[PDB]
Amino acid sequence: HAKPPYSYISLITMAIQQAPSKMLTLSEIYQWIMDLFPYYRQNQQRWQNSIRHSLSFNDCFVKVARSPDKPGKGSYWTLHPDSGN
Amino acid sequence: HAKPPYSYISLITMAIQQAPSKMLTLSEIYQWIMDLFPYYRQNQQRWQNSIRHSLSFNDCFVKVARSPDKPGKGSYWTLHPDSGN
DNA sequence: TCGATAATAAATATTT
DNA sequence: AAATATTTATTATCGA
Ligand SMILES: [Mg+2]
């Protein structure tokens, strides 16, 4: 397919918004984007770099530590309170 | 009632995509945006100008004339095939 | 970080 | 008397 119009901030925001408890890991963000948008099933090394960049660079995305029981790869990412949600 | 992250291109694309006929008039685009995003119920004079600019400036949006037997203000807008979706 | 794209703000232009 | 459509420049923001 062709590239959808969504910015990386928009792609991440939509992924978080539909996520159980409005939290998901980086790899879950990757998977949601690829599941919904066939364009992103390729050039993964490039756009996933852009995803990681967008999560860190923008204050609207906030890191949340894993639980001590069921800890794992990466933290959860969520939306900052003074966005819309 | 906070500003959603979506670009004007993304807002228009989403509005058209959800239309039963896959086409919307300009005023229908305005209404869909305002219905879904309360933020856009203000400053309509500004962002609706931006909507019109985005519709004309981008080739992914293509104008479709009303039938001669059903005239009115403005044409229908839809997504062009030569732009993916 | 640097190159690309979006968006704000107009005047202009078309049409009902 | 208006909604709609096109166009240009500039500022802001995005993204490779
Ligand atoms: Mg967007």
Author numbering:
A (entry chain C), B (entry chain A): 168 to 252
What wording appears in the published article?
Forkhead box (FOX) proteins belong to an evolutionarily conserved family of transcription factors expressed from yeast to humans, and possess a highly conserved DNA-binding domain (DBD), called the ‘forkhead box’ domain. Most FOX proteins bind to the typical FOX DNA-binding element (FBE) 5′-RYAAAYA-3′ (R = A or G, Y = C or T) to regulate the transcription of their target genes. Here, we found that FOX family proteins bind to the non-canonical homotypic cluster of the p53 promoter region (TP53). Analysis of crystal structures of FOX proteins (FOXL2 and FOXA1) bound to the p53 homotypic cluster indicated that they interact with a 2:1 stoichiometry accommodated by FOX-induced DNA allostery.
We further determined the co-crystal structure of FOXA1-DBD in complex with p53-DNA (5′-AAATATTTATTATCGA-3′). However, FOXA1-DBD2 bound to DNA at an unexpected position distinct from FOXL2, where helix 3 of FOXA1-DBD2 bound to the major groove of extended DNA formed by crystal packing, and formed apparent protein–protein dimerization with FOXA1-DBD1. In FOXA1-DBD1, His220 (corresponding to His104 in FOXL2) made contact with the base of T8′ and also with that of A10 via a water molecule (3.0–3.3 Å). Asn216 (Asn100 in FOXL2) formed bidentate hydrogen bonds with the base of A10′ (2.9–3.1 Å). In the wing 1 region, the backbone of Ser242 and that of A5 formed a hydrogen bond, and the side chain of Lys240 was directed to the major groove of DNA, interacting with the bases of A2 and A3, and water-mediated interaction with T16′ (3.3 Å), constituting additional contacts between FOXA1 and p53-DNA. Distinct from FOXL2, the protein dimer interface between the N- and C-termini of FOXA1-DBD1 and FOXA1-DBD2 was observed in the structure of FOXA1-DBD in complex with p53-DNA. Importantly, Ser174 and Ser177 in FOXA1-DBD1 and FOXA1-DBD2 formed Mg2+ coordination with their backbone and side chains. The converged dimerization, which refers to the opposite direction of FOXA1-DBD molecules on DNA, was observed, involving unexpected interaction between N-terminal parts of each protein, which was mediated by magnesium ions.
